[PDB]
RNA sequence: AAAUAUGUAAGAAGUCCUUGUUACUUAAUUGAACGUGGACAUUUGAAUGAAGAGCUUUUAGUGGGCCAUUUUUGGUAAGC
RNA sequence: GGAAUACUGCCAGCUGGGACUGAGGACUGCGACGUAAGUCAAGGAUGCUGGCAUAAUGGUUAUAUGCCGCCCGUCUUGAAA
RNA sequence: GAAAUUGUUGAAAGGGAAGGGCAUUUGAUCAGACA
């Protein structure tokens, strides 16, 4: 019959990142996690207890509970036509800090820094982000850059 | 009660954009440009006429 | 052909006229429709929507709920306006003097306000006093205290009053309600 | 009389008819599953700061 | 009583300064339209005389016209077309050219034809097919006061200020473009020019990136 | 694909902060308008250099006119076409009045005799043949003879009316 | 080790400063969590769009499907 | 060396012929032309002339002609079967 | 004293079905306003 076990279809998902086997480095145990932090889930194959389900590998959630050797995260899971909130208990070996939030903070600090200097000197801070605008007109010089004329290559087999 | 199209009804063309009255004075669409007499450089000639 | 994003010919889903055939109620709708159209006051638009509500959407307001609202800071002289029926409460013994305007008054509630030196007026007498609704205070009763509300959304791990006729032993207290018999809900 | 076992056809179109919606986040979320030792002290922390403001606006 | 001649004379006098302000601002646009065109031509001539090549700035606005109909559209292009307000065939709108909008155009390429419009085709589009969106109603412009009533806070108070805001992409392009109702164009008077319509213009069809030749096809549909 | 024109297109592929002043490549394009001339420019630069449209830009596009459009010339054309089975090289000679007119005849000749469409033909090199006795093809050497005269027998005179009252004559 | 699909973030429920609460925690007013007070407004933190957003009750029909593009399994193959 | 023409584009350039449509029903608004009085193609057609007041038009019906049109209901993925 | 069905008279059509839809001719028939 069919097989739908807890760790089904996890042959390569829980591998040990070839030539990174053995014990885990000590920097993952000295990182602090507070309530409200944003973390992403990436399970470790060498730690069996507190291992997340295969569905949550790669997901990103918010920490809501700080236990002794584990943390509680909040994951929004799409079931049917709605999203369901999930509360998960994972040890610190299966999670890490999410860098997507990191660059947001100094943008807040830079936006406050750009706005603070402009209150003394001038209105129109222009603190918003903009997409890649189309390039403007310039002048192409051919001094020492005479255009070389190209032609398509004739068919050659060279087998 | 009825949409009258400009560019072929001159009374509507003067209700909107009142600059259109003096646009026909100098005619502003058959303007003669100043005739400059500079020529392109030599290096552009053999590049265009290259084989 | 138009690629429609929303539902075509969809109604607003809100009442614009009362379903009742009361000729006196339609006179108040006729009066307050003129007031909300020609005053630009936010008070008159609330009354029209409150006058279109059904019986379950206009819960009775006890006379003790009015007295609690007049204990607020700087609200002892505001005219209480209730779009519904004001009922009498026997759990209070001291009632203030401020007048209350409402649609219906019970025998107990009308006698209690007048005995305390109050004044019970109708909604059409408020229009000649406060056309813009100045110094008013709209009060409306609780909607989720109804007996039909507690049965809504019944399901596992909800605790939402399953629909039953008779209560007591041998009536929905067996397996499915305790850990001794099977499982706990 | 074999029939059709299972398919996923028209399932994504049915789910998008009413739209997949956000879980409607709130301020002050539920404290289910939080550390009971931390919650036992947080109850007393709010009790002491309630009477502190009661003695400041007495 | 009064007000039969008094404030009528005041209204006919107050409307005269608005006609004078529009006349002098419309004159100011005419000089800088022709100055910006002569300068690009003169920059191309001066670079050729100096032994150089003058490249021009990339166009900052395109006019997107829907070609494909309604039935049999994949969901991802279907959602993109609804975000550009192209809900029917032969519908047109202006799109600001950025990195985010250029990726939007590549998804719906087999269904739309777009390109860089000139001043003549933009001016004729607003005068004939110009409709405003006021309180979810499709109100024809037909007057400078209706544009002043709904768009007067962002400077634009005439039909040429809105046109100047389109071709010269300024700080208020989003509010000016969204005020205009999507254009309802007809089929071209001379045909599409190709035996088959649903091919790329490079391969001999009509969709894809189609630059300033787009002025010929838009004016035939208008 | 249409009434052809000849263009020159120059690429620049975008100068980074490490390498400024790139090599400014150039080739000659036979196309119908400026839309396809830029498209066919990037088609061959992806066959010769590490470049695409997103990593490069177009410097200048100019239409090349015939220097002597009123002189009959002999052209030698090298092409690279893709058949149903394999790719072959071919050299053909066309006697016409201009470079753009010889390309028009070549595309009609290759499609009629070899069933090759426009997308399967690569124009390697077109060159004017300066001297006679260099024409190696027999279908061009016939018109290089001294005092070339030939009639046109069996003149098919096209009519307009459906009924004619005379018996037609095909004299010339 | 792709392409296509996929998770999160792009602010007021934010940031910063000041110092109150606790039976938790720390060698320790150290920390943690929650507040008091103060400062910073909508070019307030990318683009585009919105016949508005949110929520509840009740009930009908259906629970034999088929075809096509592409991916793909069994089979010599099939309108399998 | 000096021009013309072709090609592409612009004109709030001029002008002729044809077709379909005439909705709204005191005044109000935005304009234009005029020294003014006023006028105007400016928030929807008027003016003049002829013919018939009967089978002129129109309706109904039969027939003819051109094109199109398979049986109704039912179960079914699928019915003119 | 209805329909199915049948007789007579009158009108019309018919080259291996009939019946129908749009448009008009022809024939029969009807109406209006005559202000």
């Amino acid at each position: 019959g069919k097989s739908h076990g807890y760790r089904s279809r996890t042959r390569y998902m829980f591998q040990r990142d070839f030539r990174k086997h053995g014990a885990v480095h000590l920097s993952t145990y000295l990182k602090v996690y507070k309530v409200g932090d944003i973390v992403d889930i990436k399970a470790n194959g060498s730690i069996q207890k507190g291992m997340p389900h295969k569905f949550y590998q790669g997901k990103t959630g918010v920490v809501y509970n700080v236990t002794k050797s584990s943390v509680g995260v909040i994951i929004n899971k799409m079931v049917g036509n709605r999203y369901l909130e999930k509360r998960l208990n994972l040890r610190v070996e299966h999670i890490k800090h999410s860098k997507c939030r990191q660059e947001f903070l100094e943008r807040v600090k830079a936006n406050a820094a750009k706005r603070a200097e402009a209150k003394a000197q001038g209105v129109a801070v222009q603190l918003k982000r903009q997409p890649a605008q189309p390039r403007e007109s310039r002048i192409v010089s051919t001094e020492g850059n005479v255009p070389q004329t190209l032609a398509p290559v004739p068919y050659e087999t060279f087998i | 009660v009825l949409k009258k199209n400009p560019l072929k009804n001159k009374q509507v063309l003067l209700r909107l954009n009142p600059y259109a009255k003096v646009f026909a004075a100098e005619k502003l669409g058959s303007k003669k440009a100043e005739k400059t007499g500079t020529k392109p450089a030599a290096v552009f000639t053999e590049t265009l006429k290259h084989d | 052909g138009i690629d429609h994003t929303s539902k075509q010919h969809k109604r607003s889903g809100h009442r614009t006229a009362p379903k009742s055939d009361n000729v006196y109620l339609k006179l108040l709708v006729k009066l307050y429709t003129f007031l909300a159209r020609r005053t630009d006051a936010p008070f008159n638009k609330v009354v029209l929507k409150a006058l279109f509500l059904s019986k379950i959407n206009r819960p009775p307001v006890s006379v003790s709920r009015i007295a609690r609202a007049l204990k607020q800071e700087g609200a002892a002289n505001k005219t209480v306006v209730v779009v519904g029926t004001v009922t009498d409460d026997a759990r209070i013994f001291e009632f203030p003097k401020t007048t209350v305007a409402a649609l219906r008054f019970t025998a107990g509630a009308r006698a209690k306000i007048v005995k305390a030196g109050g004044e019970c007026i109708t909604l059409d007498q408020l229009a000649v006093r406060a056309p813009k609704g100045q110094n008013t205070l709209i009060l409306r009763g609780p909607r989720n205290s109804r007996e039909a509300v507690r049965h809504f959304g019944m399901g596992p791990h909800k605790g939402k009053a399953p629909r039953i006729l008779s209560t007591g032993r041998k009536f929905e207290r067996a397996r499915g309600r305790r850990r001794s018999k099977g499982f706990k809900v | 009389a074999k029939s059709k076992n299972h398919t996923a056809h028209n399932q994504t179109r049915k789910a998008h008819r009413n739209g997949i919606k956000k879980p409607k986040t709130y301020k002050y979320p539920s404290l289910k599953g939080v550390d009971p030792k931390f919650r036992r002290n947080h109850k007393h922390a709010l009790h002491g700061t309630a009477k502190a403001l009661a003695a400041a606006k007495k | 009583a009064e007000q039969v001649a008094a404030e009528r004379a005041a209204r006919k006098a107050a409307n005269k300064e608005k006609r004078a302000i529009i006349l002098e601002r419309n004159a100011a646009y005419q000089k800088e339209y022709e100055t910006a065109e002569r300068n690009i031509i003169q920059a191309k001539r001066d670079a050729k005389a100096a032994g150089s090549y003058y490249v021009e700035a990339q166009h900052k606005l395109v006019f997107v016209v829907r070609i494909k109909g309604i039935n049999k559209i994949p969901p991802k292009p279907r959602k993109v077309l609804q975000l550009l307000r192209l809900t029917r065939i032969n519908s047109g709108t202006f799109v600001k050219v950025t990195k985010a909008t250029l990726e939007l155009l590549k998804l719906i390429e087999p269904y739309v034809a777009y390109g860089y419009p000139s001043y003549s085709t933009i001016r004729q589009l607003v005068y004939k097919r110009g409709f405003g969106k006021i309180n979810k109603q499709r109100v024809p412009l037909s007057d400078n006061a209706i544009i002043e009533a709904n768009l007067g806070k962002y400077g634009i108070l005439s039909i040429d200020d809105l046109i100047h805001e389109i071709i010269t992409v300024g700080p208020h392009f989003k509010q000016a473009n969204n005020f205009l109702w999507p254009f309802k164009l007809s089929n071209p008077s001379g045909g599409w020019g190709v035996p088959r319509k649903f091919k790329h213009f490079i391969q001999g069809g009509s969709f894809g990136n189609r630059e300033e030749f787009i002025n010929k096809l838009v004016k035939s549909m208008n | 694909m249409a009434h052809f024109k000849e263009y020159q297109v120059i690429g620049r592929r975008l100068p980074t902060e490490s390498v400024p002043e790139p090599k400014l490549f150039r080739m000659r394009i036979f196309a119908s308008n400026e839309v396809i001339a830029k498209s066919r420019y990037w088609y061959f630069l992806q066959k010769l250099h590490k470049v695409k449209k997103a990593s490069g830009e177009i410097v200048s596009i100019n239409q090349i006119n015939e220097a002597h459009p009123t002189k009959v010339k002999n052209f030698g054309v090298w092409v690279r076409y893709d058949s149903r089975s394999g790719t072959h090289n071919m050299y053909k000679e066309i006697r016409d009045v201009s470079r753009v007119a010889a390309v028009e005849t070549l595309y009609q000749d290759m499609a009629a005799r070899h069933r090759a469409r426009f997308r399967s033909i690569h124009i390697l090199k077109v060159a004017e043949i300066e001297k006679t006795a260099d024409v190696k093809r027999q279908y061009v050497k016939q018109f290089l003879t001294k005092d070339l005269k030939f009639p046109l027998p069996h003149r098919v005179q096209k009519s307009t009316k459906t009924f004619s009252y005379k018996r037609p004559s095909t004299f010339y």
Side-chain angles (χ1 to χ4, degrees):
Chain A
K2 296 282 189 174
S3 180
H4 293 298
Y6 198 82
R7 286 182 48 158
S8 193
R9 313 165 187 163
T10 60
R11 184 178 209 252
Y12 301 118
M13 206 183 312
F14 294 150
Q15 267 201 354
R16 186 64 179 170
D17 215 343
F18 162 74
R19 295 179 66 250
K20 293 169 197 307
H21 288 242
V24 181
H25 52 96
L26 269 298
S27 54
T28 190
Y29 299 105
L30 295 167
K31 292 182 183 293
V32 303
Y33 302 100
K34 313 198 300 166
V35 167
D37 270 28
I38 291 189
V39 294
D40 49 352
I41 308 171
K42 176 182 172 40
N44 199 295
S46 73
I47 303 302
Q48 275 84 27
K49 318 183 66 55
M51 185 180 288
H53 193 250
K54 50 152 167 176
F55 174 76
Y56 300 100
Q57 170 99 340
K59 301 296 188 291
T60 295
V62 193
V63 187
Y64 82 106
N65 186 36
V66 186
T67 310
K68 173 176 70 54
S69 63
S70 77
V71 288
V73 308
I74 296 288
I75 314 292
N76 291 338
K77 172 170 190 184
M78 182 179 72
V79 184
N81 58 311
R82 63 203 156 96
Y83 276 88
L84 273 168
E85 158 167 314
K86 292 267 172 188
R87 313 205 161 194
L88 264 72
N89 302 312
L90 282 72
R91 302 189 95 110
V92 300
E93 296 100 292
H94 308 286
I95 66 151
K96 48 195 300 188
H97 294 269
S98 172
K99 292 220 301 182
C100 53
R101 173 136 289 271
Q102 183 66 41
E103 289 91 6
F104 172 61
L105 277 296
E106 69 275 16
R107 206 164 53 85
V108 173
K109 184 174 73 68
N111 276 329
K114 291 174 70 175
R115 205 202 284 259
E117 312 180 19
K119 298 298 293 295
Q121 72 98 25
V123 176
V125 176
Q126 190 58 255
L127 57 85
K128 274 191 183 187
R129 280 179 309 165
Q130 283 307 306
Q133 297 316 295
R135 53 186 89 107
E136 307 180 14
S137 71
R138 49 187 169 268
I139 296 183
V140 176
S141 166
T142 178
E143 180 66 27
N145 211 347
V146 164
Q148 293 82 17
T149 301
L150 299 177
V153 54
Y155 175 72
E156 174 53 51
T157 75
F158 63 93
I159 297 89
Chain B
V1 306
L2 170 74
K3 180 137 172 48
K4 290 188 183 287
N5 189 359
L7 294 174
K8 54 173 153 171
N9 202 316
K10 293 182 183 293
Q11 287 309 303
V12 180
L13 178 61
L14 300 173
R15 170 203 300 171
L16 325 178
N17 196 16
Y19 188 66
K21 176 188 167 314
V22 307
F23 198 95
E26 294 83 4
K27 298 287 287 185
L28 294 175
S30 299
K31 182 63 69 177
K32 188 158 280 186
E34 182 65 26
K35 180 67 174 66
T36 178
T38 187
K39 291 177 71 68
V43 66
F44 179 72
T45 308
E46 293 83 3
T47 304
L48 174 75
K49 281 176 182 173
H50 182 254
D51 293 333
Chain C
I2 298 95
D3 201 2
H4 290 310
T5 42
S6 68
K7 194 144 293 197
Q8 293 310 119
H9 306 122
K10 182 175 73 175
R11 276 184 296 285
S12 59
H14 302 88
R15 282 202 179 178
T16 61
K19 203 173 291 297
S20 163
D21 287 357
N22 204 333
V23 293
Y24 297 118
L25 179 61
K26 293 187 286 185
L27 287 190
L28 278 178
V29 175
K30 186 167 143 185
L31 160 75
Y32 267 108
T33 307
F34 176 76
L35 275 179
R37 208 188 69 233
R38 202 176 179 180
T39 314
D40 291 331
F43 179 80
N44 303 308
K45 294 147 196 60
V46 181
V47 185
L48 286 174
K49 303 183 163 284
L51 274 180
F52 298 155
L53 293 170
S54 65
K55 202 207 174 188
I56 65 153
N57 291 321
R58 306 173 284 106
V61 168
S62 73
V63 65
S64 51
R65 204 180 200 89
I66 296 166
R68 208 212 278 276
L70 300 163
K71 284 180 69 178
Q72 299 174 11
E73 290 89 298
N77 280 350
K78 287 169 160 50
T79 292
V80 178
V81 181
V82 170
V83 186
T85 300
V86 167
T87 54
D88 168 50
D89 208 325
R91 291 164 315 186
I92 62 170
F93 321 103
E94 312 76 8
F95 189 68
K97 187 268 183 181
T98 311
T99 175
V100 178
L103 263 179
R104 270 154 181 111
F105 285 88
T106 75
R110 178 169 260 119
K112 196 172 176 62
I113 296 170
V114 176
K115 183 175 174 66
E119 194 183 6
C120 314
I121 59 168
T122 58
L123 281 185
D124 77 309
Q125 283 165 298
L126 190 75
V128 301
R129 288 189 182 198
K132 299 214 205 69
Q134 49 261 16
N135 217 34
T136 59
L137 189 71
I138 312 173
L139 289 192
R140 64 185 180 181
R143 286 196 185 180
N144 285 357
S145 59
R146 206 163 92 252
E147 182 65 26
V149 169
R150 43 179 270 193
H151 306 281
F152 290 161
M154 187 66 204
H157 311 291
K158 307 277 186 68
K160 292 299 291 180
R163 273 159 188 159
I164 207 167
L165 298 181
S166 314
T167 64
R169 197 187 75 91
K170 313 133 69 178
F171 300 114
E172 303 214 2
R173 280 190 212 275
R175 164 206 172 269
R177 181 62 69 190
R178 52 185 58 223
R179 277 185 92 270
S180 296
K181 314 293 203 318
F183 53 91
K184 178 81 169 69
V185 173
Chain D
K2 316 213 295 180
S3 60
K4 183 174 174 67
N5 313 308
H6 156 80
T7 196
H9 199 74
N10 212 44
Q11 297 318 295
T12 47
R13 194 159 27 191
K14 276 215 304 209
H16 282 98
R17 279 305 294 275
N18 296 321
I20 318 175
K21 65 178 72 66
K22 297 316 283 159
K24 180 71 154 303
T25 178
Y26 302 101
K27 197 179 178 177
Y28 307 101
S30 77
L31 294 186
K32 165 197 283 181
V34 193
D35 192 17
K37 199 208 280 193
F38 161 73
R39 185 177 65 246
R40 206 183 295 118
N41 185 58
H42 189 260
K43 174 200 283 197
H44 298 322
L46 292 182
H47 289 170
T49 192
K51 66 183 291 294
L53 271 73
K57 289 265 203 85
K58 181 69 174 177
Chain E
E2 62 94 20
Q3 66 87 31
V4 292
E7 293 82 3
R8 193 177 154 71
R11 186 183 66 190
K12 295 292 183 180
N15 287 345
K16 200 170 277 189
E17 294 88 4
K18 308 174 98 190
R19 282 293 282 246
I21 287 167
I22 289 167
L23 190 150
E24 62 92 21
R25 184 176 294 175
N26 287 4
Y29 292 156
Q30 194 56 51
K31 280 73 176 175
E32 61 86 20
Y33 291 166
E34 65 190 2
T35 307
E37 183 178 1
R38 291 288 107 188
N39 283 340
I40 301 299
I41 290 168
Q42 214 57 46
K44 291 187 180 191
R45 289 162 161 179
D46 288 333
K48 285 208 299 275
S52 298
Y53 299 101
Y54 174 80
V55 310
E56 61 264 13
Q58 290 191 320
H59 304 83
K60 306 188 282 179
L61 185 141
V62 298
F63 185 69
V64 186
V65 194
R66 187 167 166 167
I67 306 304
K68 184 75 186 175
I70 303 302
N71 312 95
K72 309 189 177 178
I73 304 297
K76 189 163 291 204
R78 184 176 178 179
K79 178 69 175 171
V80 168
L81 283 162
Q82 290 159 14
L83 290 183
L84 294 188
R85 310 182 298 166
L86 311 168
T87 59
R88 60 216 308 178
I89 187 178
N90 300 330
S91 183
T93 187
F94 297 104
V95 175
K96 189 175 177 299
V97 179
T98 54
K99 185 57 174 63
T101 70
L102 269 179
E103 294 293 328
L104 277 179
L105 277 184
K106 294 201 303 190
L107 279 176
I108 47 157
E109 267 190 353
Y111 320 105
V112 306
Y114 64 96
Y116 316 129
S118 68
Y119 173 65
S120 49
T121 174
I122 279 175
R123 190 181 152 264
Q124 289 170 13
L125 264 178
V126 192
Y127 288 165
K128 192 174 179 218
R129 308 295 174 96
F131 280 79
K133 184 175 67 168
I134 300 138
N135 285 77
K136 317 300 175 296
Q137 310 260 303
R138 188 179 165 250
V139 175
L141 294 184
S142 172
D143 194 44
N144 279 324
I146 318 175
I147 315 185
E148 190 276 331
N150 305 276
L151 210 59
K153 64 179 72 66
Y154 321 98
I156 295 155
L157 61 83
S158 73
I159 203 168
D160 311 83
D161 300 330
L162 188 138
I163 282 176
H164 175 251
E165 204 72 32
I166 294 305
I167 190 167
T168 78
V169 185
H172 298 312
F173 177 72
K174 193 213 203 300
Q175 288 91 39
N177 185 39
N178 202 247
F179 168 71
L180 293 164
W181 202 269
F183 295 90
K184 294 157 65 92
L185 315 177
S186 64
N187 284 297
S189 294
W192 295 91
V194 285
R196 283 184 52 80
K197 183 172 72 175
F198 299 116
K199 300 183 185 169
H200 208 278
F201 187 76
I202 301 166
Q203 291 200 130
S206 43
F207 65 76
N209 191 18
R210 184 174 64 189
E211 68 275 16
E212 293 83 3
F213 293 93
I214 201 58
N215 314 309
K216 209 174 80 72
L217 188 141
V218 163
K219 275 173 162 179
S220 61
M221 293 177 71
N222 193 14
Chain F
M1 58 190 151
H3 208 56
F4 275 108
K5 294 163 204 63
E6 188 171 24
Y7 298 96
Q8 69 160 0
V9 189
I10 297 171
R12 184 177 178 180
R13 47 153 303 165
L14 276 166
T16 73
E17 69 275 16
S18 163
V19 64
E21 294 293 328
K23 294 317 284 174
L24 269 189
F25 301 107
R26 181 209 171 248
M27 65 179 288
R28 286 177 85 155
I29 309 293
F30 288 108
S32 315
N33 47 359
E34 293 179 353
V35 176
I36 319 177
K38 296 170 198 179
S39 173
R40 301 297 287 164
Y41 184 69
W42 297 114
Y43 174 68
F44 296 122
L45 276 296
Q46 306 213 45
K47 268 154 170 39
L48 303 179
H49 276 270
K50 184 64 66 68
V51 66
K52 39 186 180 180
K53 191 160 155 310
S55 176
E57 65 183 1
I58 294 300
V59 184
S60 169
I61 175 168
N62 313 89
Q63 189 183 7
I64 310 172
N65 284 333
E66 198 73 30
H68 302 287
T70 74
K71 188 186 86 77
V72 182
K73 304 170 267 289
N74 299 295
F75 295 96
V77 179
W78 288 260
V79 297
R80 171 198 206 267
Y81 64 93
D82 196 354
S83 46
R84 295 175 203 173
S85 65
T87 309
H88 325 285
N89 309 288
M90 185 179 288
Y91 167 66
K92 292 177 71 68
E93 292 175 351
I94 284 152
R95 177 177 157 90
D96 211 312
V97 76
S98 62
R99 285 170 55 91
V100 70
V103 170
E104 283 269 341
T105 313
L106 174 83
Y107 274 122
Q108 300 299 131
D109 192 359
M110 286 288 316
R113 291 191 157 90
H114 302 285
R115 259 66 190 174
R117 279 92 175 151
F118 173 76
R119 64 173 181 263
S120 280
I121 291 164
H122 295 255
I123 303 300
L124 305 180
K125 175 167 73 97
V126 65
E128 183 178 1
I129 298 173
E130 299 292 325
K131 291 174 70 175
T132 78
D134 294 334
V135 174
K136 51 189 63 53
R137 290 301 183 264
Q138 198 41 250
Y139 48 88
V140 177
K141 250 173 161 173
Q142 303 182 139
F143 304 102
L144 307 179
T145 76
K146 187 80 187 309
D147 291 331
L148 175 67
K149 305 156 194 175
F150 57 98
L152 294 169
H154 202 88
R155 173 176 72 195
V156 297
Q157 192 183 104
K158 182 67 181 294
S159 177
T160 61
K161 298 177 78 170
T162 75
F163 301 116
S164 68
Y165 292 86
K166 182 175 73 175
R167 208 90 191 190
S169 74
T170 76
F171 83 106
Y172 210 67

